[PDB]
Amino acid sequence: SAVQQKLAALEKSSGGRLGVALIDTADNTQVLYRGDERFPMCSTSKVMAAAAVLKQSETQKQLLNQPVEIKPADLVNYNPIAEKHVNGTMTLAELSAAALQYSDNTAMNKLIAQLGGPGGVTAFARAIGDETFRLDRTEPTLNTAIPGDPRDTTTPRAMAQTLRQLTLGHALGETQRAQLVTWLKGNTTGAASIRAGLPTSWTVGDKTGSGDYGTTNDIAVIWPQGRAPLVLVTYFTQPQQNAESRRDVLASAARIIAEGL
Ligand SMILES: [K+]
């Protein structure tokens, strides 16, 4: 009830720019707020890169076990897992899990390199019907989040549709879809974001993102108790380059959505 009024009020109180896209797969209804505006994805783009490598592994059947060298010079600004394996190797499965569940930026860069560069991630998006997503840069510069810059952006509507196809539809093969869902459900970074606005009994798999301009993002698949899953994207960015993160705004958006549901 009055979901538009409530989301607009939350955005006004927050001082920033809020983008929401819900898909309720019980009946295919949607709730959209700035659903067609572009937002900087930051680490939520790791879902598209991991999924692209999963798709590659449908035909390169041992790809996920392939070792990748981690060198000291490869470390960027946030490498909680890769720093443990510097001067050694990680497999592409280990890199995918590190990217998704710890938001490891060096792991992201290895996924991007496996796909031939940022354009390889965009090409996979196009192959699964996403004409809006674009990845332009590697980590860490994909997080600059400059207002009006289309680089490394998507819209909430497009990201929600793609996350539905990846996790609940058939953009991936059955084993690969299950692997993506397993990884998202094991995320370590999400308890303050969409999850915090939802009943604790619900099952959530999500990927967070953060960057400059206080950009604070989360994209989630949600299995509510006793009903069909939801897909929810909450993107948020702020006027000041050095603004603080606002995961509470994402939780507040999710809580509004769960009320009107
Ligand atoms: K920040």
Residue numbers in the entry: 27 to 57, 59 to 238, 240 to 252, 254 to 290
Give excerpts from the publication.
We last aimed to assess the utility of ED-MS for resolving ligand binding in a protein of interest for drug development, the CTX-M-14 β-lactamase, referred to simply as CTX-M-14. Using the same data collection routines established for papain, MicroED tilt series were acquired which yielded a 2.5 Å resolution structure of the apo-form of CTX-M-14. This structure was comparable to single-crystal XRD structures determined on macroscopic crystals grown from the same batches, and offered a clear view of the antibiotic binding pocket surrounding catalytic residue serine 70.
By combining microcrystal electron diffraction with native mass spectrometry (ED-MS), we develop an approach to rapidly and accurately determine structures of biosynthetic or clinically relevant ligands bound to enzymes. We demonstrate this approach with the model protein lysozyme bound to its noncovalent ligand N,N′,N″-triacetylchitotriose (ACT), then use the cysteine protease papain as a scaffold on which to bind a panel of both known and potential inhibitors, including the epoxide-based covalent cysteine protease inhibitor E-64 (27), its commercially available chemical analogs, and analogs generated by biosynthetic reaction. Overall, our results demonstrate that structures of protein–ligand complexes can be obtained directly from microcrystal slurries by ED-MS, with unambiguous confirmation of the identity of the bound ligands.
